[PDB]
């Protein structure tokens with residue numbers, strides 16, 4: 001009945017988890033996520049760059065168990081809007097999560113089902129506590145890859161549809177060379 | 190309704206988490222743990238050095254929640270036996286754990302209730318997955334502190350009792366300049 005313990009090497013400098021499952025999100029995988037649709041179409045047809053990669057070590061979906069995954073969020077903008085992850089709530093709403101920032105400059109945008117928002121700035125050494133019930137997205141606000149490690153219950157799941165449906169209440173943009181969190185003009189209510 | 194999300198800074202060089210709860214284990218606190226009881230007596234009377242320190246950020250004991258803690262495990266030997274953490278089962282047996290090595294050279298010893306044992310070497314960048322039902326102890330096999338971060342369920346709790354009397358089935362020693370994992374002389378059922 002007892003499962004096999006294991007260790008894996010993580011390269012903090014590159015985010016790569018040796019032997020883990022890898023996922024790639026390119027800009028073309030993110031249709032309807034950025035405000036500036038035209039700058040999105042423009043970049044997709046010109047370059048279709050990698051927005052982010054995930055290396056994930058995941059267990060069977062059972063209570064008490066834990067998963068972990070690194071994300072490499074590459075630097076870039078879609079118009080004025082910084083590259084980010086698609087973002088999600090968890091399928092189970094009574095599940096928290098911990099992020100450990102490893103390299104680069106970024107932050108996490110967070111929101112409840114109602115629409116109340118939170119921004120937490122992330123730099124190397126930052127550990128962020130993601131409480132039960134908050135959807136969460138990370139954003140790279142710098143010019144180098146933003147790299148972090150996430151630890152999360154094996155049974156949490158992922159609800160993306162709700163974020164693909166409504167987006168987040170706030171957006172993170174650069175404006176006069178200054179980084180700002182402001183209202184999403186597309187937002188529901 | 191809804192807990193605040195938060196970030197705290199963790200210094201990967203020192204293990205220090207600003208404002209977290211600091212716990213100190215000194216060698217006197219570990220009577221009956223090391224094989225060589227007379228080296229134990231001697232080092233205690235002569236110094237009572239700190240074996241390890243813990244910086245824990247903990248939530249109430251609710252299922253789905255997560256705690257994180259750093260340990261700084263200092264270098265040393267009680268006789269041939271390297272410095273370790275006391276070790277424990279989780280009070281809710283079916284709760285996993287994830288460790289991230291930050292500094293120094295070390296490893297983890299792991300044991301089932303019936304007594305299956307495993308050794309997992311740890312260096313900067315190693316991530317160790319601790320399955321449900323496995324007791325776990327970390328050991329510093331080098332000359333500088335062994336610093337790691339752990340993330341665990343808020344309701345996992347601790348079973349120290351079992352380990353204190355039965356011990357671990359294997360021990361980690363220096364011999365003729367060589368690090369070895371061998372049978373534990375003080376071990377029965």
Ligand SMILES: O=C(O)[C@@H](O)[C@H](O)[C@H](O)COP(=O)(O)O
Nearest residue numbers: 054069071085086087088150152
């Ligand atoms: O578990 C998490 O929350 C993260 O590992 C994310 O899955 C990862 O950062 C990729 O983002 P998303 O799942 O929002 O595409």
Ligand SMILES: O=C(O)[C@@H](O)[C@H](O)[C@H](O)COP(=O)(O)O
Nearest residue numbers: 243258260274275276277339341
């Ligand atoms: O949660 C854990 O498993 C760790 O944070 C340990 O408690 C920590 O390393 C100290 O060891 P122990 O609790 O065995 O004294």
Ligand SMILES: [Mn+2]
Nearest residue numbers: 090097136152
């Ligand atoms: Mn998540």
Ligand SMILES: [Mn+2]
Nearest residue numbers: 279286325341
């Ligand atoms: Mn533990």
